[PDB]
DNA sequence: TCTCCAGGCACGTGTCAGATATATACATCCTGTGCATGT
DNA sequence: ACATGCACAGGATGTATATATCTGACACGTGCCTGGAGAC
């Protein structure tokens, strides 16, 4: 329950025939952008996509990312949507193309059924059985156990490897602890003392649970939502199993590493083996790169090969720049910061500025969204500031003018409260005018130029 | 678990106070599946309890009821409201709680008669946990109504 | 979709876990374990085997 | 299932003849380019020869004239035999290691060693297992299996019974006991014991019994590059590095000793060296520090043939300040041999759009195809190839079957081609941030 | 053949899987039959 | 004027929670004695 800058947006607000009807579901106007975004959304939800470029041009303050939240609320919860920026990929551990590919494989999801094999019992007799251990330095070594699990209906008396014994041993399982040996990894989480050993005169603050009902060898199926980047991280730094690489690999500090091409191809073949068994379902998604002009030329070079893949999500770029200089090489200027070679992949969607009545509708929607009711003369005053100064300046003169209204015992916001909040809180243009006028000379009462 | 159910959350508060008072509770349910869920909860908060429901075999019934009555360590008895006829005596219990009400008034009445009976010494208090804004309030009305017809005619 | 909605209502008021309870889940597992065949064969004295291998293989 | 239609999913080879090297004008996807495809055919036929060093062929040409198309055609026209490695030239500027060494690994990834040695495997359904664990242990046991033809009993060692309770071999599994190691890969489940499986899903696949003999020798053929052996011989258990990129600066004496043992393997007849192809996409994104190493890595016996593609005209070289043709220094342009491409005639544009339409299975009227060719004359191949996918979906909005002029004219209306986008930037200067100013209405 | 004892037989017993009605409520499916409309 | 089709009447059927009973087949315990087993 916090009104952010984008709360009134609840979708594109499209008709059945794909025609954008203005002033519907949060937006005001903006027809030719919302129809194209609806086309993009149905391009996502048809799965004939292996990399398409969609650019969202237009000046600042025209609602480029409002369309992005509209797309992300129109696709749904069960479709991946990865929003990043252009400044997020400059890392210090890995090269930035690795961060690009990690975002590309964050934006591809997979829905997998799994059959876990738990052994859910109460430990009755725990007795190790060591083997022969000749002179080799380390000494004796436990090699076989006889742990007896006791469920509600039919006990069982099973025999263990050394590694699953070490999984027990790093959990501190005494006699009486109910556990659940997971025979996929080998892990085994102690749950608590069984209630047959219950005593209110206790100090360890243990969690007493009853005996697990049912068969001691259960078998249960679940559904899991896993992206391909999760599989990349899982096969890159192993943290499952009971050997030494996967145990000394979870005591170290975690570092982002460079998952190479061979792992990213082998996991593709493994996922295709899952799909061919009729278990997993593939659901591709969106990579929304906001502020794409901050990416330098070494990233637009690599996006070509990243989009030529047979599996690659749809890219939605946002760029509020005119004719500008690309960050990498400072000797070729182009539109939007996009290089003139990469720009041909893109299906460029324009975005046009607003009108003095559309500003009034946006002010009315934002006021009834935040919870600030006001009069029509005050709405005309804020729309006058919206025409003169900026769009996202006049929206921000509603939050002080409420508080100031509550200073004067009012409920609705009148002309006086906005006429005072326009004097307390300033914009950028009049502040720069005061800066240039008053800051004549550097000195004691000047500005550091 | 204890917070995903409004009733359960309110029962928790009430059982803590009851325990600290040294009260002993018959706690009545209309669903034995719920009897199970609770059985858990009681294990967590580590209270002693018995159980008697329609699954409980006859001599086991006799045994359980006798316990509750012999050995004051047991704090709650989880009873299915319709199960067990007239003539089980639980007059060591001084508190009754209905986790859910019956549509028929008389079944809850027969249930509280297990505490309120000859040989009872302490004052029986009957809680009734009602979820506001739901079927539970409907039920409660429809049952008070029925009791009005009984009151009008058999007077 | 559910049949006797007055019964369903009372269940909700009692506890949502009457409907679909959760239970110690776990994270997804990528490797290849060994599935048990049946329940009625390995009666009492069974032995667990550390069968955890990765589906990612590297053949040399 | 992981075969989503990309921008190059219609190329099924180079498409040229392999007898007189004639570029037949429409085959396997590559349509229209003739002289460049014949030169790529000559290069392809001297790759499979093997009796040449690592040389350098530069596919120069304008944007969207089919350069990645020719490279992908050469990739599809080799199969999984000769190692083709793509390298967009910004994977080199890493931080895990230096930059010249990251280039050296990409050279070493494309020189395969192909060795062929035999194994002994066992097919067959398990009839039954008896294990004498009676307190006893894994000491002795009997294994009765069968194919459709054979049937047999084997006795088992202790280190095989410990692999049978490791994989939990039931009575009815279809296993593959590799005899030389002892691993057990269950190929599936037999159909005839479908009653005997209770702890399985309701939907579960079942196979048939394996056909033939039960004890046979396989001649498997493995092919690993020199970078594979380099990363293997670098740590204690170091092959994980080439799956996690955590390899660092590999010392050069390891590479020298492996270059010696590969020659000693070749002279003993135990091995065979296969020179691969390395495709350096966008080679203009290398600074002169790279070219001063590619000029000498293309000198040794063990060097793959480098194919590379450049877009820029007379442009600057990174690292330095002086301009040069194709973004490459002149002492490196002495090494390379250049293939120039050409822009596309409109009938070739029309049939490329026809192939891209038949690849996605979108029906087109010929009037819409004429309009789309007219658009592609003025906006390039990429714009029209995206208008196809847009127009199919716009026809699917209003429940149509074939796309028409009334949908291509909507896709051309919503999604601007980049020429009109440049015109939009030039006619909306004062609000778009050029370098300094923001004007708000 | 002389010898022994335990396996099996007769006999109780006890219990629980599937079956017999049902208090507690209500929505739903059913179809006899009546009325209206059309030929 | 007659026949056919379409919706009221209010009943039987139906859904869901445990209760209250029950029955007969299976398993288990007991007692005992004769015949299967020993071995010369
Ligand atoms: N069509 C619209 N309807 C309502 N609000 C809008 C619309 N377009 C823009 N806005 C407002 O403009 C503000 C900034 O838009 P934003 O997308 O951040 O601009 P930019 O395109 O520069 O990123 C948002 O708070 C949003 O409320
Ligand atoms: N001969 C051809 N046959 C079929 N498609 C072609 C041919 N040449 C180019 N294309 C298409 O044109 C597009 C541009 O080719 P590409 O090589 O990617 O351009 P660039 O050389 O700028 O990378 C590709 O998507 C490819 O599908």
Q: What 3 state SS string does chain D have?
A: CCCCCCCCCCCCCCCCCCCCCCCCCEECCEECCCHHHHHHHHHHHHHCCCCCCCCEEEEECCCCCCCHHHHHHHHHCCCCCCCEEEEECCCCCCCCCCCHHHHHHHHHCCEEEEEEEEEEECCCEEEEEEECCCCCCCCCEEEEEECCCCEEEEECCHHHHHHHHHHCCCCCEECCECCCCCCECCCEEEHHHHHHCCCCCCCCCCECCCCCCCCEEEEEEEEEEHHHHHHHCCCCCCCCHHHHCCCCCCCHHHHHHHHHHHHHHHHCCCCCEEECEEEEECHHHCEHHHHHHHHHHCCCCCCCEEEEEECCCEEECECCCCEEECCCCHHHHCCCEEEECCCCCHHHHHHHHHHHHHHHCCCECHHHHHHHHHHHHHHHHHHHHHHHHHHHHHHHHCCCCCECHHHHHHHHHHCECHHHHHHHHHCCCCCCECCCCCCCC
Check D200 against C35: CB less than 8 A apart: yes
The verdict on a CB contact (< 8 Å) between A209 and B39 is: no
C-alpha distances in Å from residue A227, one per residue of A241, C28, D24, D245:
21, 11, 44, 20
Residues in chain A: 449
Q: Residue B142 CA to nucleotide E35 C1', Å?
A: 40
Q: Round and report the angstrom distance from CA (D133) to C1' (E4).
A: 36
Backbone angles phi, psi at B42, to 5 degrees: -70, -35
Whether there are 3 or more C-beta pairs closer than 8 Å between C and A is yes
**Which chains form contacts with chain C, at 3 or more CB pairs under 8 Å?**
A, B, D
Residues engaging strand F (CB under 7 angstroms): B 31-34, 53-55, 80, 82-85; C 3-4, 7
Distant-in-sequence, close-in-space partners of D38: CB < 8 Å, separation ≥ 6? D16, D21, D22, D23
Distance from Cα A76 to the centre of ligand 1, integer Å: 21
Strand E: list positions under 7 Å from protein Cβ.
Answer: 23-26
Task: Give the CA distances from residue D1 to residues A273, A274, A278, in Å, rounded to whole numbers and listed in that order.
Answer: 10, 10, 11
Report how far ligand 2's centroid is from the alpha carbon of A211 (Å): 66
What are the two backbone dihedrals, phi and then psi, of residue D298, each rounded to the nearest 5 degrees?
-95, 30
Distance D238 CA to ligand 1 centre (A): 52
C-beta separation of D336 from D84 below 8 A: no
| E strands present in A247-386 | 281-284, 286-289, 314-318, 323-325, 333-335, 346-349
Q: For atom 11 of ligand 2, which residue has the closest CA?
A: D66
Q: How far apart are CA D104 and CA C18, in angstroms?
A: 63
CATH class belonging to D346-425: mainly alpha
The whole-angstrom separation of Cα A217 and Cα D371 is: 67
Distance, in Å, from the CA atom of D441 to the CA atom of D429, rounded to the nearest integer, reads 12
Contacts of A224 in chain C (CB under 8 A): 28
Find out whether D231 and D97 touch, Cβ atoms under 8 Å. Answer: no
The CATH class, in words, for A356-437 is: mainly alpha
Q: What are the phi and psi torsion angles at B10 (to 5°)?
A: -85, -30
Q: How far apart are the first and last CA of chain C?
A: 55
**Test mutation, A124, A155, A185, A212, chain C, max C CBs within 10 A:** A185
Using the beta-carbon criterion (under 8 Å), do B4 and C15 form an inter-chain contact? yes
Return the number of other C-beta atoms located less than 10 Å from residue D260's C-beta: 10
Are D434 and A324 in contact by the 8 Å Cβ rule? The answer is yes
| Nearest-angstrom CA–CA distance, B7 and B26 | 16
3-state secondary structure of B26: strand
Q: Which residue's CA is the nearest one to ligand 2's atom 25?
A: D7
Q: Let me know if D98 is exposed, middle or buried by CB neighbors in 10 A (0-12, 13-18, 19+).
A: middle
CA distances from D387 to D3, D372, D416, D418, D434 (A): 21, 8, 10, 13, 30
Contacts of D60 in chain A (CB under 8 A): none
Would you call B2 an interface residue with chain C, using a CB distance cutoff of 8 Å?
Answer: no
What lines the ligand 1 site, CB under 6 Å? A 5-6, 27-28, 30, 60-66, 320, 362, 391-392
Residue with tokens 């054979």: D150
Q: Is D141 annotated as a binding residue?
A: no
Closest CA to D306 of D103, D25, D73, D161: D103
Contact C14 B100 (CB under 8 A): yes
Coil, helix or strand for A216?
Answer: coil
Please state, as a whole number, how many other Cβ atoms lie within 10 Å of the Cβ of residue D220: 11
Chain B: nearest CA to A323, how far in angstroms? 57
* Distance, CA of D67 to C1' of E34, in Å: 84
- Tell me how the structure was determined: cryo-EM
Structure tokens at D213: 């003999």
How far does the centroid of ligand 2 lie from the alpha carbon of residue B129, in Å? 73
Instruction: Give me the residue label for tokens 């130029």.
Output: A449
Residue C15 · residue B5 · CB < 8 Å: yes
* D8 annotated to a ligand binding site: yes
User: How far, in Å, are A325, A326, D315 from residue A332 at the CA level?
Assistant: 6, 7, 9
Is A113-223 a CATH 3.40.50.620 domain?
no
At how many degrees (to 10) do helices A399-407 and A415-424 cross? Answer: 120
In A242-375, where does DSSP find H-type helix? 261-276, 297-307, 358-370
Binary contact (B43, A208; C-beta < 8 A): yes
What residues pair up with A413 in beta bridges, in sequence order?
A374
């Amino acid at each position: 329950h916090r009104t952010a800058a984008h709360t009134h947006i609840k979708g594109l607000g499209l008709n059945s025939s794909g025609i954008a009807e203005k002033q519907a579901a949060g937006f005001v106007g903006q027809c030719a952008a919302r129809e194209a975004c609806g086309v993009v959304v149905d391009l996502i939800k048809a799965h004939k996509m292996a990399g398409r470029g969609v650019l969202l041009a237009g000046g600042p303050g025209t609602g480029k990312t409002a369309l992005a939240l509209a797309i992300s609320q129109e696709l749904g919860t069960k479709i991946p949507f990865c929003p990043i920026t252009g400044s997020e990929i400059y890392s210090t551990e890995v090269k930035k193309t690795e961060v690009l590919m990690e975002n590309f494989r964050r934006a591809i999801g997979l829905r997998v059924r799994e059959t876990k094999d738990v052994y859910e019992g109460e430990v009755t007799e725990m007795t190790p059985e060591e083997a022969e251990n000749p002179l080799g330095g380390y000494g004796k070594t436990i090699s076989t156990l006889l742990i007896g699990l006791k469920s509600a209906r039919g006990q069982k008396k099973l025999r263990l490897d050394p590694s699953i014994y070490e999984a027990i041993q790093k959990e501190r399982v005494q006699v009486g602890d109910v556990i659940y040996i997971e025979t996929n990894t080998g892990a085994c989480k102690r749950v608590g003392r069984s209630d047959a050993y219950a005593t209110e005169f206790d100090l360890e603050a243990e969690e007493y649970v009853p005996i697990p009902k049912g068969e001691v060898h259960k078998k249960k199926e679940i559904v899991q939502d896993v992206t391909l980047h999760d599989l990349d991280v899982a096969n890159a730094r192993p943290q499952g199993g009971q050997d030494i690489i996967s145990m000394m690999g979870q005591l170290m500090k975690p570092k982002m590493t460079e998952i190479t091409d061979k792992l990213r191809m082998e996991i593709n073949k493994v996922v295709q083996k899952y799909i061919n068994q009729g278990v997993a379902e593939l659901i591709p998604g969106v990579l929304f790169i906001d502020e794409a002009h901050m990416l330098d030329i070494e990233c637009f070079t690599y996006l070509n090969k990243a989009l030529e893949s047979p599996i690659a999500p749809i890219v939605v770029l946002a760029s509020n720049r005119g004719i500008a200089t690309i960050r990498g090489a400072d000797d070729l200027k182009a539109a939007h910061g996009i290089p003139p070679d990469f720009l041909q992949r893109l299906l460029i969607i324009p975005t046009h500025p607003y009108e003095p009545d559309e500003i009034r509708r946006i002010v009315r929607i934002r006021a009834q969204t935040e919870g600030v009711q006001l009069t029509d003369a005050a709405v005309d005053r804020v729309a006058e500031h919206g025409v003169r100064i900026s769009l996202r300046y006049c929206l921000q003169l509603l939050a002080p003018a409420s508080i100031l209204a509550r200073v004067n015992g009012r409920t609705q916001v009148d002309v006086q409260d906005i006429a005072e909040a326009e004097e307390l809180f300033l914009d950028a243009r009049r502040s720069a005018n005061i800066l240039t006028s008053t800051g004549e000379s550097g000195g004691l009462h000047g500005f550091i130029s | 678990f204890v917070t995903d159910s409004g009733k359960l959350a309110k029962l928790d508060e009430l059982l803590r106070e009851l325990k600290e008072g040294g009260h002993r509770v018959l706690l009545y349910f209309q669903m034995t599946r719920m009897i199970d869920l609770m059985e858990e909860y009681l294990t967590y908060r580590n209270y002693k309890y018995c159980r008697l429901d329609g699954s409980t075999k006859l001599e086991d019934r006799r045994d359980t009821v006798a316990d509750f009555q012999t050995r004051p360590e047991i704090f709650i008895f989880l009873l299915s409201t319709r199960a067990g006829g007239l003539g089980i005596n639980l007059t060591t219990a001084d508190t009754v709680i209905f986790y859910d009400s019956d549509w028929n008034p008389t079944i809850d009445s027969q249930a509280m008669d297990r505490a309120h009976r000859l040989g009872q010494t302490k004052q029986v208090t009957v809680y009734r946990l009602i979820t506001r804004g739901t079927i539970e309030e409907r039920i409660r009305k429809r049952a008070l109504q029925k009791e009005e017809v009984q009151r009008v005619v058999i007077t | 979709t559910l049949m006797n909605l007055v019964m369903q209502f009372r269940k909700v008021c009692n506890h949502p876990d009457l409907f679909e309870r959760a239970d110690t889940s776990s994270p997804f597992f990528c490797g290849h374990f060994a599935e048990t065949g049946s329940f009625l064969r390995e009666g009492t004295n069974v032995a667990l085997g550390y069968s955890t291998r990765s589906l990612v293989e590297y053949r040399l | 299932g992981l075969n989503l239609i990309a921008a190059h999913s219609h190329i099924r080879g180079l498409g040229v003849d392999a007898d007189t090297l004639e570029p037949r004008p429409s085959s396997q996807g590559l349509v229209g380019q003739e002289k460049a495809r014949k030169a790529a055919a000559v290069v392809l036929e001297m790759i499979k020869q093997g009796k040449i060093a690592g040389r350098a062929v530069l596919i120069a040409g304008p944007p969207s004239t089919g350069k990645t198309a020719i490279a992908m055609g050469m990739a599809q026209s080799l199969g999984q035999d000769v190692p083709f490695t793509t390298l967009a030239a910004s994977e080199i500027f890493s931080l895990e290691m230096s930059k010249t060494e990251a280039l050296t690994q990409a050279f070493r990834k494309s020189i395969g060693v192909r060795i062929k040695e035999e194994s002994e495997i066992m097919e067959g359904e398990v009839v039954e297992i008896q294990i004498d664990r009676s307190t006893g242990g894994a000491k002795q046991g009997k294994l009765t299996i069968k194919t459709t033809d054979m049937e047999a009993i084997y006795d088992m060692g202790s280190k095989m019974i410990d692999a049978m309770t490791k994989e939990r071999v039931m009575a009815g599994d279809i296993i593959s006991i590799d005899k030389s190691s002892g691993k057990i890969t269950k190929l599936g489940r037999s159909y005839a014991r479908s009653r005997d499986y209770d702890a399985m899903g309701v939907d579960t696949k079942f196979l048939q019994c394996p056909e033939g003999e039960l004890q046979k020798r396989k001649e498997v053929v493995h092919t690993v590059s020199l970078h594979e052996i380099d990363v293997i011989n670098s740590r204690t258990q170091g092959f994980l590095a080439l799956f996690s990129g955590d390899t660092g600066e590999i010392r050069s004496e390891i590479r020298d000793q492996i270059n010696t043992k590969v020659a000693e393997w070749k002279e003993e007849g135990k091995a065979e060296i296969v020179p691969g192809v390395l495709f350096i996409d966008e080679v203009h994104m290398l600074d002169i520090e790279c070219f001063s190493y590619i000029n000498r890595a293309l000198e040794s016996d063990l060097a793959p043939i480098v194919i590379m593609a450049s877009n820029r005209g007379v442009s600057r070289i990174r690292g330095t300040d002086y301009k040069s043709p194709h973004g490459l220094p002149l002492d490196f342009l002495d090494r390379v041999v250049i293939i120039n491409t050409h822009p596309y005639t409109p009938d070739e544009l029309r049939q490329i759009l026809s192939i891209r339409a038949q690849e996605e299975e979108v029906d087109l009227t010929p009037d819409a195809l004429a309009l789309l060719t007219k658009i592609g004359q003025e906006a390039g191949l990429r714009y029209a190839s995206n208008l196809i996918t847009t127009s199919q979906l716009i026809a699917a909005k209003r429940r149509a079957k074939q796309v028409g002029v009334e949908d291509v004219q909507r896709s051309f209306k919503l999604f601007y081609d980049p020429a009109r986008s440049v015109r939009f930037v030039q006619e909306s200067e004062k609000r778009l941030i050029g370098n300094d100013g923001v004007v708000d209405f």
